[PDB]
Amino acid sequence: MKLSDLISRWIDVEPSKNAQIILRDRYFMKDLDGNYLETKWEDVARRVARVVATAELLNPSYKKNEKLDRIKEWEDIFFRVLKARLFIPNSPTLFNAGLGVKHDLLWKPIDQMTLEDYEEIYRSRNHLHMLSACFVVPVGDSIEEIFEAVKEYALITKVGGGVGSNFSELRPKGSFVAGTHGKASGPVSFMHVFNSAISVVKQALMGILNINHPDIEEFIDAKKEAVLNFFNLSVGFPMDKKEILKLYEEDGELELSHPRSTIRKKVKIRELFRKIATNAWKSGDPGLAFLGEMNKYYPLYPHRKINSTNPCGEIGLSDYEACNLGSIDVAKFYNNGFVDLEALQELVQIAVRFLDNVIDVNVFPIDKITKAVKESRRLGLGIMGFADLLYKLEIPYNSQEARDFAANLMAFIALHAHRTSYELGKEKGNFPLLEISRYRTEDNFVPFAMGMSNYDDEIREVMKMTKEFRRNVALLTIAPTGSISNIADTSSGLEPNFLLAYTRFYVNQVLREKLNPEILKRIEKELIEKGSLKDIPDVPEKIKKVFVVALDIDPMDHLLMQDAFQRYVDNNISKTINMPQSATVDDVLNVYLEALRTNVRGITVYRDGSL
Amino acid sequence: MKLSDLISRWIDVEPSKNAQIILRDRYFMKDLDGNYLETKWEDVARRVARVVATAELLNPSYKKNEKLDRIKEWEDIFFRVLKARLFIPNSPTLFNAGLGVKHDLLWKPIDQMTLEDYEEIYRSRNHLHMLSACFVVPVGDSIEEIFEAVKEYALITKVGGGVGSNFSELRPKGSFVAGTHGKASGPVSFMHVFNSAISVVKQALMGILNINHPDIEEFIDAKKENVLNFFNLSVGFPMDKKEILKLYEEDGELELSHPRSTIRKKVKIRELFRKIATNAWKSGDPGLAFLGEMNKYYPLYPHRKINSTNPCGEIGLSDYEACNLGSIDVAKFYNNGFVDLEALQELVQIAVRFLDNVIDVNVFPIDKITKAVKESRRLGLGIMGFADLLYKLEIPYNSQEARDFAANLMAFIALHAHRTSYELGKEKGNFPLLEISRYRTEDNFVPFAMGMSNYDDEIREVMKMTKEFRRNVALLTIAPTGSISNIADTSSGLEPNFLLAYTRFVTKEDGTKEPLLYVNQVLREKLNPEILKRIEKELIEKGSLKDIPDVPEKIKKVFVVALDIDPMDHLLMQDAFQRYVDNNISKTINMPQSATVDDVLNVYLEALRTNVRGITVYRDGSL
Numbered sequence A: 001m002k003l004s005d006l007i008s009r010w011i012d013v014e015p016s017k018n019a020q021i022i023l024r025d026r027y028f029m030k031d032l033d034g035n036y037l038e039t040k041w042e043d044v045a046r047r048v049a050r051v052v053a054t055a056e057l058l059n060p061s062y063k064k065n066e067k068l069d070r071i072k073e074w075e076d077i078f079f080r081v082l083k084a085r086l087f088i089p090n091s092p093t094l095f096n097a098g099l100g101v102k103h104d105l106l107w108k109p110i111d112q113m114t115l116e117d118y119e120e121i122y123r124s125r126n127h128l129h130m131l132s133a134c135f136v137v138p139v140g141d142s143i144e145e146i147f148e149a150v151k152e153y154a155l156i157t158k159v160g161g162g163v164g165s166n167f168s169e170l171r172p173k174g175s176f177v178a179g180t181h182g183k184a185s186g187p188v189s190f191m192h193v194f195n196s197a198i199s200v201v202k203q204a205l206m207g208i209l210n211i212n213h214p215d216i217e218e219f220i221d222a223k224k225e226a227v228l229n230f231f232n233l234s235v236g237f238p239m240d241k242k243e244i245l246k247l248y249e250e251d252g253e254l255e256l257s258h259p260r261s262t263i264r265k266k267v268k269i270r271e272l273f274r275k276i277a278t279n280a281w282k283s284g285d286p287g288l289a290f291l292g293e294m295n296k297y298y299p300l301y302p303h304r305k306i307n308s309t310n311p312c313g314e315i316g317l318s319d320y321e322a323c324n325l326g327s328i329d330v331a332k333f334y335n336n337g338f339v340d341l342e343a344l345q346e347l348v349q350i351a352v353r354f355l356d357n358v359i360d361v362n363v364f365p366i367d368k369i370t371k372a373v374k375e376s377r378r379l380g381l382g383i384m385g386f387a388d389l390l391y392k393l394e395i396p397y398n399s400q401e402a403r404d405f406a407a408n409l410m411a412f413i414a415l416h417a418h419r420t421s422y423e424l425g426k427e428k429g430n431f432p433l434l435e436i437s438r439y440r441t442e443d444n445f446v447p448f449a450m451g452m453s454n455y456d457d458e459i460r461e462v463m464k465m466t467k468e469f470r471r472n473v474a475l476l477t478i479a480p481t482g483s484i485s486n487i488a489d490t491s492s493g494l495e496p497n498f499l500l501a502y503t504r505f506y507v508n509q510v511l512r513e514k515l516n517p518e519i520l521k522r523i524e525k526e527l528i529e530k531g532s533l534k535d536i537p538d539v540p541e542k543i544k545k546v547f548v549v550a551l552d553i554d555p556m557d558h559l560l561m562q563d564a565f566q567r568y569v570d571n572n573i574s575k576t577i578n579m580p581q582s583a584t585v586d587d588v589l590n591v592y593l594e595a596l597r598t599n600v601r602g603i604t605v606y607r608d609g610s611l
Numbered sequence B: 001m002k003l004s005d006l007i008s009r010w011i012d013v014e015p016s017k018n019a020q021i022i023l024r025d026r027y028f029m030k031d032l033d034g035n036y037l038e039t040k041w042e043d044v045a046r047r048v049a050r051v052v053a054t055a056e057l058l059n060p061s062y063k064k065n066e067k068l069d070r071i072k073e074w075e076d077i078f079f080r081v082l083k084a085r086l087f088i089p090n091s092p093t094l095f096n097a098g099l100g101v102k103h104d105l106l107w108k109p110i111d112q113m114t115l116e117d118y119e120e121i122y123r124s125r126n127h128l129h130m131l132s133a134c135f136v137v138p139v140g141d142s143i144e145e146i147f148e149a150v151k152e153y154a155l156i157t158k159v160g161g162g163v164g165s166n167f168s169e170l171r172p173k174g175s176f177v178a179g180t181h182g183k184a185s186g187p188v189s190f191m192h193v194f195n196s197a198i199s200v201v202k203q204a205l206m207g208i209l210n211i212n213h214p215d216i217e218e219f220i221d222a223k224k225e226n227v228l229n230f231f232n233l234s235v236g237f238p239m240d241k242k243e244i245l246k247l248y249e250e251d252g253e254l255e256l257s258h259p260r261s262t263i264r265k266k267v268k269i270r271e272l273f274r275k276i277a278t279n280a281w282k283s284g285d286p287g288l289a290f291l292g293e294m295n296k297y298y299p300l301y302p303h304r305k306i307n308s309t310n311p312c313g314e315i316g317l318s319d320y321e322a323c324n325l326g327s328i329d330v331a332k333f334y335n336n337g338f339v340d341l342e343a344l345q346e347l348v349q350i351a352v353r354f355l356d357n358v359i360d361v362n363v364f365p366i367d368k369i370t371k372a373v374k375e376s377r378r379l380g381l382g383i384m385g386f387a388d389l390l391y392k393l394e395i396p397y398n399s400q401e402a403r404d405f406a407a408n409l410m411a412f413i414a415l416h417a418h419r420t421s422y423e424l425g426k427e428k429g430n431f432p433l434l435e436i437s438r439y440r441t442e443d444n445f446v447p448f449a450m451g452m453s454n455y456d457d458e459i460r461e462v463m464k465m466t467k468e469f470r471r472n473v474a475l476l477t478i479a480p481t482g483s484i485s486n487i488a489d490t491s492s493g494l495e496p497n498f499l500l501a502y503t504r505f506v507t508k509e510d511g512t513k514e515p516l517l518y519v520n521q522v523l524r525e526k527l528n529p530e531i532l533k534r535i536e537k538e539l540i541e542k543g544s545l546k547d548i549p550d551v552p553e554k555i556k557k558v559f560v561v562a563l564d565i566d567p568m569d570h571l572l573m574q575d576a577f578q579r580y581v582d583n584n585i586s587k588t589i590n591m592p593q594s595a596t597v598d599d600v601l602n603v604y605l606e607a608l609r610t611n612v613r614g615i616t617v618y619r620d621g622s623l
Ligand SMILES: Nc1nc2c(ncn2[C@H]2C[C@H](O)[C@@H](COP(=O)(O)OP(=O)(O)OP(=O)(O)O)O2)c(=O)[nH]1
Pocket: A141, A142, A143, A144, A170, A171, A176, A177, A178, A179, A182, A183, A184, A185, A186, B128, B157, B158, B200, B201, B202, B203
């Protein structure tokens, strides 16, 4: 089906009562007196479309002559997919597009727009016009750099960004400070100053410490039981995953050291791993960030380096880099037993241009960030609706069938997104750092593992073409989509449905269609208690096996789904490895070891009932 | 007596074992290994004398063939008064002088020193070579400025400075923030971020909020145990003391308002005072800062404006200003029933040059601070050992006699301090803002109240003369001297002795522990050693001589401690010194456990009528 025809299928499907509540609550603009300037999703779609279309003002391919026509065309296409909720950008784009702009320019009808109208939108974007979810700032080993980072956290947090740092540069607790006296207090103590700052600004962060840091044990125990409540904590593994797996298998020792300290110590890697696992078992923190694996696929490494991710894991970013995200609802592409790939390719091309255009109309609080974004132009296109699509396709999330499907789907998306980036580099100009990247200096560089799709060879040649032309250093991610999937009335990112029937502060729509009412109306009671179909007798085996929820799916099937998607994603993936309440610490270690052998770039575990 | 003769009486008296522990503990310099580079007070005095004498390189009145002789002469005099412990600068001068300099230059015999040796010292002072105790920075009403200030606090604290701010620019909690629909959190929420920052960096501060800020009540209670545990807190009074007294006397109302909020409130000034008094009665916070009174006597006002003090309250500073302090031990100037004014004058002269010289060798971590200090050259010359001096002269602290003597002594110090500033302004150049100060644009400007001394008219004359030459915007203070009075083995600041005897413990390898009885040295000298041994027991038990049978009445009357002296007599002493001090004074108004909140109010009311620039109260037994 053509995308315009898919759009006509979805454009007039109204957001649910639940979606409308969230939108009124957080998304619709209000005036200086709390009066609504927007009252429907279509108002949001119009403002967002128009502001992002404005980027086409800077398109060197257009003559001043056609610009108005071309702009209005892009506004029109952006508006239609958005109103149809086939693609939605990350929250900050929805909150903050048009901040600074005359109200009378933001919702005016497109046929009435003039070239001067777009120019004035472009020029009136203010300091709050911040449209990206993801940030990483360094924290250098000096009081000066530490507290400059604290200020950067406050400023990014204030404008609506989530920020992450690797704190490893900070010399360990007790290290000599060539001051008068006395001693360095170490990374963890300074992370409390970050927490306290953000707790007041927000009156959601990421903190990583590398496995070979001498204060790693204190770090692992840092949210145990003063927390640290605004931090997600991950242990960083800057070295090769293979190397750590070997060391664990051999019961080796890790040397803890720091370049600006005499503090040195040896620890058994197994002991340290177990300590990580025990705490994750108890409370879900800390996670694992496979930084080396991220740098393995980083086009700008080693002259730039990924040291941290954003709070949710899904983008590894170099220092001062930010990334804006957006997600395609794949559940809307179900068509009579198949994914309508015709319409999908069209949308992926549109989604990539929109995300790239967001960069040009984005305003950041810190010039170093403006600069890092301009040079790399990293994007984060992902998907949501995945689990709901599997229900429509009558495929069990816990099956090799689902994972082979997932991999081909992501490969197809990756192929058309990178092809779009080639196209946009031709039209608009390459990302400034193309010349020094592995797309250019290397042969056969591919920013992900592949190995589970028929599309590989096609991907490999598109990657070779991007030696010459390429708008973006990387393009793909899979985010949590915690709010935008609610707006889209669909499942979140790549996660299975957590529950089929609930009451968020609500019976799945696909289940409501496939399940005979009466079988439904009976069971909807004990579905809500119990939280699964599994042990409800007199529901058909076929419904049971397809309509699985997160805790129907064992930890290994969670991890293998993440691997299958990660093979064709150039940034990272947000995925929780749900574990049953009866899972032991050994079960958790086994997840870590399997994770080390797969292509996953990080791990988050959550044991049911643990918190 | 000539100062040289006084120096020779003291130069070979080594610090008490008590002092030496303090020195080893934190003053003596160590190498990267943890090894001692200094092991005697004499070593510290060489280093410091040498480093501060280096500033004479820059003296535009020395011809090149003069310079090396002149510098060695200043190093020698500096060394002697330090070694003798007649003058000691604030701790950061003693911690940090010479940091960055090659160890082979800091202690070498002076008769091996060359001009190039001094030039190398000047060049190699590093970024940690911070010699001043006292700082103020502004905290403006934006996230950017608030966190820029958190960063300055961390940097200033790291290098050994104590910093304060007025947080009144921050719009009250619940205020409108433009272009968003979220509200401002308020000054007290941000002060938590500053307390967190500094609790890690130090793993006190001064915070002031003005009495008319709408969050003033929250602030008054901010260290109420239900904590800003690294802050001293004071309430700011930027209006005239007179205005506030009148309002209180009328049972009037104050309007709380902010220029960037629509939040207004009317509160009875008496109810606000009582809230303050009750909290201070419970816990010692908050104190009162009479900022308007400080601005009354600030020579740069209103071009520049004092909005805060340092943590101990004794310097009022404008935005980004810092001050270096030091103190003369005046108990050492006792001579046959009189204060030796001839030797004291000479030492004021030396001490003011030292302190002004510290500015030249000081390194600050922030641009705007270097600038503010160069432009003003504020100093804080003070005294310690004043209580022990009264003991020697047999004057009771809690008496008009003591207060009249304090005023005259402070007046004499002020006169010769400001005179030296005059002489130094001709010799080295005036402070840059002389031209726009009240020393220039006015007639009869005096930066303190006076009214309690025979020296008043000569003081007027010198202030008139400094319309022409003046090296420093202000010169004097009285500081707590919590460490350096320990070092000099003398009483702290202008304060009375807290106790005359107590047990201190000397840590030993094989024992331990151990009991070591200290008795005030002047008490030891005056009281019968036979009497002493009898009473010693009850004195440590009771904390005073007052109710001990059969100690002579005159001894009980002279040898008073802090708690023998009633709150008004503490306050009037502060008033006597403040009259002849251009900066402020550190003074705790001690109160008996049996004082009430009404008694605390009465101290505040009397404070409003005297010339004091702020108030701190501490009720015995409260914390
Ligand atoms: N908690 C605490 N940590 C400090 C202090 N001074 C330094 N540190 C920690 C902060 C940094 O992680 C590390 C280095 O800090 P700085 O570079 O500011 O110290 P500095 O440059 O004086 O000495 P350096 O030449 O770098 O060893 O030491 C301090 O006063 N308090």
